[PDB]
Symmetry: C4
Subunit: 97 residues, 4 copies
């Protein structure tokens, strides 16, 4: 189909974004007055919180670039998740018959 | 129906996730350099904030596992709530006649 | 209509929740080891952040009850806003002709 | 069309809100007991976090007005993003034929 397949697949996109932003924000903060976004195994848990947009505050970028990577990893979530909602929004309309 | 019943019921699923993650993240952090996620009556209020994805920051996991439980209790919310939006999105289309 | 009127009106409901939770969480925290949720003009800005679910962390309840009021003022937002999305989701389908 | 064009365009609205709230919250906090919302290049990253509603906590307004600008820059996001979800919700229904 699409509405049901454009989603199940997109997520496989967000996950890339995560791992992508993770091992990129680090190399953007690793050397500077910034928080623990100086470790790959740390950026991960950050990508996730950011992507889910929960913002624990426990971690965040301070590097101009690191902040960019944040924005990206953000929409990725607001978006990657939106589709899943879209998918469901129609699969509830697919019961109009 | 479905669109209107697949929701009212799913929530009864998220609530399980809460209580589920609550009394699981604790036993994952209870003994370690981590925050108050060392008390069941505390993990709760955390499951909720996390699930609603508000991330007060007042509490969060530091245990690799405790972080997993977080992720889970997270989607549960982004999702459990999405349906409710889906439900409503169609119940507004159910006025096309 | 509905999809377009059930929303514009619901918000007038959330706003009540705000002012409602505001001047209720205070009288729940006002006298205790809790944060500034001890002032009505402060609970407001909290209801808002909470309702929008942004969780600055700058403020939060510590009173068991105050935490309840939080939950409420939370869904109110996840929900009150969901409808508005629902409304829009259909007003985009109302262009199928 | 609309559902697909009312979105791609709205965002160009939120971005204005950002830059708009950015260089406005500052001049509202710049001179007071408030956080770094005293620098334009700082308010930005705040508008974004706020707009995405992630609330890192790293920054927030304390000025009554600065708090207003927050609210605004908030809905702008909850809303500007909602449409995009709406758009997608229908573009999944546009496969009912
Ligand atoms: K959020
Ligand atoms: K948040
Ligand atoms: K926070």
């Amino acid at each position: 189909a699409l509405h049901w397949r454009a989603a199940g697949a997109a997520t496989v996109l967000l996950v890339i974004v995560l791992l992508a932003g993770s091992y990129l924000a680090v190399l953007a903060e690793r050397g500077a007055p910034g928080a623990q976004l100086i470790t790959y195994p740390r950026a991960l848990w950050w990508s996730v919180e950011t992507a889910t947009t929960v913002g624990y505050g426990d971690l965040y970028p301070v590097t101009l670039w690191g902040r960019c990577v944040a924005v990206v990893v953000m929409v990725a979530g607001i978006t990657s998740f939106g589709l899943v909602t879209a998918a469901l929004a129609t699969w509830f309309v697919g019961r109009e018959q």
